[PDB]
Scaffold this active site. Sequence first.
Site, PDB file in Angstrom:
ATOM      1  N   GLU A 126       0.839  -1.194   0.000  1.00  0.00           N
ATOM      2  CA  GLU A 126       0.000   0.000   0.000  1.00  0.00           C
ATOM      3  C   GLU A 126       0.873   1.243   0.000  1.00  0.00           C
ATOM      4  O   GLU A 126       1.707   1.422   0.886  1.00  0.00           O
ATOM      5  CB  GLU A 126      -0.918   0.020   1.214  1.00  0.00           C
ATOM      6  CG  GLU A 126      -1.287  -1.347   1.747  1.00  0.00           C
ATOM      7  CD  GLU A 126      -1.648  -1.304   3.226  1.00  0.00           C
ATOM      8  OE1 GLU A 126      -0.826  -0.797   4.023  1.00  0.00           O
ATOM      9  OE2 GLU A 126      -2.753  -1.764   3.593  1.00  0.00           O
ATOM     10  N   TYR A 149       7.505   5.979  11.426  1.00  0.00           N
ATOM     11  CA  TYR A 149       6.314   5.966  10.582  1.00  0.00           C
ATOM     12  C   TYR A 149       5.463   7.211  10.777  1.00  0.00           C
ATOM     13  O   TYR A 149       4.960   7.779   9.823  1.00  0.00           O
ATOM     14  CB  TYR A 149       5.472   4.726  10.858  1.00  0.00           C
ATOM     15  CG  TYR A 149       5.675   3.602   9.869  1.00  0.00           C
ATOM     16  CD1 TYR A 149       6.762   2.760   9.964  1.00  0.00           C
ATOM     17  CD2 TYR A 149       4.765   3.372   8.859  1.00  0.00           C
ATOM     18  CE1 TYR A 149       6.942   1.734   9.071  1.00  0.00           C
ATOM     19  CE2 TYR A 149       4.937   2.348   7.967  1.00  0.00           C
ATOM     20  CZ  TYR A 149       6.026   1.534   8.071  1.00  0.00           C
ATOM     21  OH  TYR A 149       6.205   0.509   7.174  1.00  0.00           O
ATOM     22  N   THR A 200       8.606  -0.877   2.975  1.00  0.00           N
ATOM     23  CA  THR A 200       8.125  -0.070   1.856  1.00  0.00           C
ATOM     24  C   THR A 200       9.037  -0.272   0.655  1.00  0.00           C
ATOM     25  O   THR A 200      10.214  -0.544   0.819  1.00  0.00           O
ATOM     26  CB  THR A 200       8.092   1.441   2.168  1.00  0.00           C
ATOM     27  OG1 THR A 200       9.424   1.909   2.412  1.00  0.00           O
ATOM     28  CG2 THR A 200       7.214   1.747   3.357  1.00  0.00           C
TER      29      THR A 200
END
EC number: 4.2.1.53
Lengths: 634, 641
Positions: free
Chosen positions: A118, A237, A545
């Site tokens: 995502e 994050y 990521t």
Amino acid sequence: NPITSKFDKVLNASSEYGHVNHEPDSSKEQQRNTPQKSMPFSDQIGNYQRNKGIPVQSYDNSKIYIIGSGIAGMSAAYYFIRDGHVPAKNITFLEQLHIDGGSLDGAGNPTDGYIIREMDMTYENLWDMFQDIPALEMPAPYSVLDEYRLINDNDSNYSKARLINNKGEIKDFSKFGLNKMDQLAIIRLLLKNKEELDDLTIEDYFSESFLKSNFWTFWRTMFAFENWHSLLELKLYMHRFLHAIDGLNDLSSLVFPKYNQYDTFVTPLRKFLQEKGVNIHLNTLVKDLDIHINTEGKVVEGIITEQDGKEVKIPVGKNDYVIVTTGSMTEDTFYGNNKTAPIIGIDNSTSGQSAGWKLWKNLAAKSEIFGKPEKFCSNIEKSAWESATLTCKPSALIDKLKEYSVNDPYSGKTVTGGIITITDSNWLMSFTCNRQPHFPEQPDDVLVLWVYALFMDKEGNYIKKTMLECTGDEILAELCYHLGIEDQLENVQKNTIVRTAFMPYITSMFMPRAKGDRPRVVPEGCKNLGLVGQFVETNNDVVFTMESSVRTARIAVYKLLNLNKQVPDINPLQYDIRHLLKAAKTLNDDKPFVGEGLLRKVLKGTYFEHVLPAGAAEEESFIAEHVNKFREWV
Amino acid sequence: NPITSKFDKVLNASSEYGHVNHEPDSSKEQQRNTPQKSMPFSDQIGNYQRNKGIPVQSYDNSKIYIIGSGIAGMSAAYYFIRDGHVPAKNITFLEQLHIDGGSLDGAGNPTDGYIIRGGREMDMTYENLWDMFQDIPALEMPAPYSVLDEYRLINDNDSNYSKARLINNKGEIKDFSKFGLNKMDQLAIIRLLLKNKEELDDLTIEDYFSESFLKSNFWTFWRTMFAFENWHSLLELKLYMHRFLHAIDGLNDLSSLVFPKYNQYDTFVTPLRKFLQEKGVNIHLNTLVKDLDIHINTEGKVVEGIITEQDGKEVKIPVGKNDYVIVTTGSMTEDTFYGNNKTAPIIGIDNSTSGQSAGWKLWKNLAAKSEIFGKPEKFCSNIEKSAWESATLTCKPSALIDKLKEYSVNDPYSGKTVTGGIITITDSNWLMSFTCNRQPHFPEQPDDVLVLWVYALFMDKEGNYIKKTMLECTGDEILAELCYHLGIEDQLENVQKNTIVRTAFMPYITSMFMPRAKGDRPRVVPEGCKNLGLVGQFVETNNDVVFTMESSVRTARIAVYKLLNLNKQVPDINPLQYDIRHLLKAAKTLNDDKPFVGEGLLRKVLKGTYFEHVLPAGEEHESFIAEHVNKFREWVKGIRG
Ligand SMILES: Cc1cc2nc3c(=O)[nH]c(=O)nc-3n(C[C@H](O)[C@H](O)[C@H](O)COP(=O)(O)OP(=O)(O)OC[C@H]3O[C@@H](n4cnc5c(N)ncnc54)[C@H](O)[C@@H]3O)c2cc1C
Ligand code: NA
Ligand code: NA
């Protein structure tokens, strides 16, 4: 240099030249315009950063071995070619498993069942590459970025059923549910220096009320954090995705590729690299590196491999370079299917023994600047969970699915808009239907749904077994239970192919770490080695990521070749006052936060009224108390 | 659509397709992540913005005529080709003057003297300019290097900064470390920032700022590096502050700037022309466009012809149902009068017929067709307000260069930063400044020649040593006045024999800064216009400032993207004013780097934390916090007042 000849008068008199900081640190830079400054600010992203590399010597006679062909390693090759002007034919991939791509998979078929193991717009390094990479489904001169935006521009992503409980009723997800003490804990975490948090875990710092909040239910499921993971990584994050905080509840902060990440990103990248003349080995197991250490520094002079069943050492010349994707997340994956549970073949006594982990372990033996692999892969009980890929034909599942969808599943637009978390499930189970077809050659009557759970040691509500104990048809049973279609379980099982995967190192990236545990991209004294992936250290970027994979690759190139090029820090959107105030308001569930009322009186009717976040706030009275509350907080 | 084939299912059920906002306004956007969002925020620059145009039909039958071959007209061509897929064959330029380029001129020779009407101070925030030039072949580097590459090869390795920004008393460096803004003058700056853009119609700068402000080093800095006069647009000045808030701290020493290796004709224009010529675009020089043929009916406005003055005759170029027209509705270098060592520029117009030059006629004619094309007369009606003059010194070794070497950061002949930007003679009656950029300034400039640039802001003031107004002076005389302020007036003879001077009186150089009101500048594609786009420094954009090359590229992209209803957006200006780091730095800078109110409170909070670096450069107890809080609440209180 035949590239810089018209500049030699200036370049020779330069003090900057050749002493470039290839990885500026935005978390330490005090941004000022001084006579010293000749480069952009450490996170000054934009088109001015779109200049190319200027190699200072030829690399025609230089070979490049890249261990691991995830996006991380293919990224290194791209930039070695683009910015180093290294001939593509001089580059060799030595792949561990022999489907390229790694953690980004597009395995399976309609007959046997598909299987998947995502993003947002701030994937800045990712799109520095993919804007010049040929598109899958658009003709020249269009790129991967073009088709990515062609579909995301015209189909917004969002959820209408983020949270369900009670066998399928939609749970409310409009609020975070954070009390004041917990809102403070988040803030104090943002202020804490990064180096002060070694080995601390999330459940070590945050309260029980925090952990029971919708916020944490949101964050833990969509990002795959476990209560025992790294406090530091969570902090990172939050800095990284502060701008996104108001679209977590409905996943409106996100965008998705048209297809699975393997077909969307990996294939066009590999295909592009295959065209320029790159070499790939699909039968070479790399077990170790031959590194020579002395007074000067460290040089890789050989690669220890196992081709076939023999041990072949590949020589690395003085002029050659080596890139290693040091850790694996998908290694030792134990699959299952409909009639079959996955038989797990390791415990914490055999964890860390595998092609990929062994290579890092051997590196660490050589020098302490190669990190501490054992901190990440020595507790399967803590770094594992299990994913299930559902291949679906018309069913009672799809029937109930259409109730949760934004657009019709078969429409090719957004469906569930992201994972749908089952709050009162013992496994803490989430499922999602992405845009269909998820695979380019998918059949028109087939939907591919994906399932995921966070607790590996809890018996299900309906099936009284842990998730790793279940067959494919049993997870469907547990799923159907929480979707109120238990009474139709047969129709589902006869029409849903389920392929499970237990991945013991899937969150090893998030394990509590301390200083020196992760190596730097180019460790002290290393003249010709680069370390990339989710297990090396970057200034401020996060892991799990594709951005970090690309970020680390670029650093490797630029630092190894001493190029003129930098890799700017993460996107500075947290410093944007608009996202600060939006965050504050959102954390507080739109309640008036401190100073807001004042701030509203001053900006309403001004140029900066749009800076004010959504919601309603009104205004020495009690100012004497906040003074002495704020006075005590510090 | 053969590009879209694989996406038809989704696109034909899309709410957004064909309804893109090509010019999103960051000055109004409440940025939120909601279901409704699919695009990036209005000023979310970066690589995600590097996608490309997707034309919904073919344009092989579509001719495109572009009035003006400046950076704005060429840019529209570039993007028509890049994002419209318009055949480069199909594109024709129509230029008024003898040569391509416009305001970025770079003519002359070591024998007659060079002439640059001006130079280009830049920033890294020129996003659109660099979105384009990053893909334009380099002048002095081989393939595959871009103009962006050779630009950064010189600027990454050589900082621009000044060690003599202000001089006075016939040569002496004036202390230029502070802004000198007081309590009230600072607050007046704060408020201007807070004022809505829509409320400043027709207001001038001196209409709003005190006399103390106007004498502050701040204003001396600002007015000379941005060419502002006290009688110019208040809105424009504000726009600038918003635009360049992040650069405020490196204005005094000009460390906030980067410069092109050469004059902007050789650095920017020629690479871009070459690129477009090679793809096959056509050009017609010395062709004057007097008027357009626009058909206006119930359903819209349509260009149907171009009325041209080719040589002396009058020719009408037909425009079809499928064709497009781009107009640069005004040039700030329009109607320049040149002079030299022995000749003053003989001014052929003065106020009586200010504005009746050509190039203005086209905008004037257009304004007669509809109020939506704006009001040109607000801009070209006062030469006394819109003019000033520049001089270009071609210098052999002389007592001038010897003096220059004292102001130089690096030796003048070195190829590195020299003066670092303009040096402003504080007490010069003309308010005269002078610069020496990296030498050579022209690719073929001789080893022993230097090119200096000079301009002044006051056109109606007798000099200090030459008792005349600047435009009355010969090139030799400008050297006299200059030598006086440098202290070399006793070697004027030497300086005169070794310095060729070419002056340029530009009557409309600062016409873009004139005060304006709602409607005075047309939009890039006015209401009803199906096939006309308007570009350059006289048209309306959401937040960008004029007298830059960036704006000219900005307007060109808006032109293409609206006219063709493309998928592509033009993001607003870089959002550095929203960067808390540049906010706090600004406040501290506007207060001579002394602690500003609130700073102490903030320093109590962030010092020793992750965000310590956010605190600007320049500790009392807990007991005094209740004081600092009240004095802070009192400050924001009196802001509106
Ligand atoms: C002296 C000077 C100093 C400057 N300093 C700086 C600086 O330090 N930093 C910075 O960023 N920018 C600076 N600028 C600004 C920059 O040069 C311009 O803003 C930019 O070049 C804009 O060009 P344009 O294409 O918008 O229009 P221009 O280049 O002004 O005009 C282009 C051409 O269009 C032609 N034209 C107009 N109307 C017609 C018609 N009807 N028919 C035919 N042709 C026509 C004109 O003849 C002109 O040659 C400076 C400009 C000047 C003049
Ligand atoms: Na929300
Ligand atoms: Na300064």
